[PDB]
Ligand binder design. Structure first.
Ligand SMILES: CN(C)c1nccc(-c2c[nH]c3ncccc23)n1
Length: 337
């Protein structure tokens, strides 16, 4: 495959210590996924370690990464001080039939961090730090010259800069789009997928705020908020917590009847779970009962008052109506922060 350079998965066969382009010394593989691989490499010209994302030698993967490159170039252009929590693309090149994206080197992702908590969650204080950085990133993506919808926010796409610190960067803009050029109908990883997407309705940057609300709950509890096995199960899990979506939304939803049925009195119910709205976020978070699993009882930084502010912000991020769902500017002003 590829003159011996590739495996049968379209991946470049990594070789420890290989020199590329009279510039990079490849050290080791540090991550992998559907897109290809990420290697740690020494950039001998800039005298620093870098992460090189080696995209698969396969046209669909190449073109996904070309979208990613263009969006990163647009963003990084408007954030030269690296202050808006978006990963920094240093440069890119084609090498041995692989598109290669050279990034700053990052640490663990937030799913890795959840595993490191034994799936019991990070503290409310650390959750708040992640939330503030993520809302700042979403404010930046919403600036009009960007208008970027990430479209795949989830713990695995948020990386720590350093294992010992709370600073983060968002990665993976290969599935992203811009408000002016929305093309996709099928988007978002299932657990983090917004109701408007499930319902086949128009969408905008608010879909990323929905995902963020789901992510932040999971960061503190250790477990996904809405862990659907398929779209019907996903919507039913959302409904357990948040109730039946508003009629004015379902009346306009192309896929309303995948999940719901309209009664003679005009109201909507589920098609034949805990009853709608009875799995309270108040209890998932343990607002009055010592946090998730009661494990935060007797800990500082986890008061009822604190939890009530967190609950309020999350419920605003999980508004069914994308027009009234909280937006980044206002999330940042919320009393949780
Ligand atoms: C999808 N993905 C994993 C991805 N997409 C874009 C950038 C990065 C990335 C940048 N620096 C890193 N350092 C260590 C590990 C990964 C990365 N990872």
């Amino acid at each position: 495959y590829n003159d011996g350079y590739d495996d049968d998965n379209y991946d470049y066969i990594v070789k420890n210590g290989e020199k590329w382009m009279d510039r990079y010394e490849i050290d080791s593989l540090i991550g992998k996924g559907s897109f290809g691989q990420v290697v740690k490499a020494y950039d001998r010209v800039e005298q620093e370690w870098v992460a090189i994302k080696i995209i698969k030698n396969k046209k669909a993967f190449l073109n996904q990464a070309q979208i990613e490159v263009r969006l990163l170039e647009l963003m990084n252009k408007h954030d030269t001080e690296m202050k808006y929590y978006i990963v920094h693309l240093k440069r890119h090149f084609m090498f041995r039939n692989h598109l290669c994206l050279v990034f700053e080197m990052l640490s663990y992702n937030l799913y890795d961090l959840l595993r490191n908590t034994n799936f019991r969650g990070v503290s409310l204080n650390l959750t708040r730090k992640f939330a503030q950085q993520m809302c700042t990133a979403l404010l930046f993506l919403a600036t009009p010259e960007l208008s970027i919808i990430h479209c795949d926010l989830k713990p695995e796409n948020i990386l720590l800069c350093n294992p010992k610190r709370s600073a983060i960067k968002i990665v993976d803009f290969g599935s992203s789009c811009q408000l002016g050029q929305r093309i996709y109908q099928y988007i978002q990883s299932r657990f983090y997928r917004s109701p408007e997407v499930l319902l086949g309705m128009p969408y905008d940057l608010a879909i990323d705020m929905w995902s963020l609300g789901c992510i932040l709950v999971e960061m503190h509890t250790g477990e996904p908020l809405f862990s659907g096995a398929n779209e019907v199960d996903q919507m039913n899990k959302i409904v357990e917590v948040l109730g039946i979506p508003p009629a004015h939304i379902l009346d306009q939803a192309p896929k309303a009847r995948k999940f719901f049925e309209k009664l003679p009195d005009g109201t909507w119910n589920l098609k034949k779970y805990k009853p709608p709205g009875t799995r309270k976020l108040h209890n998932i978070l343990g607002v009055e009962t010592g946090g998730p699993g009661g494990r935060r009882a007797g800990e500082s930084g986890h008061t009822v008052a604190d939890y009530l502010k967190f609950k309020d912000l999350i419920l605003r991020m999980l508004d069914y109506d994308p027009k009234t769902r909280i937006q980044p500017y206002y999330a940042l002003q919320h009393s949780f922060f």
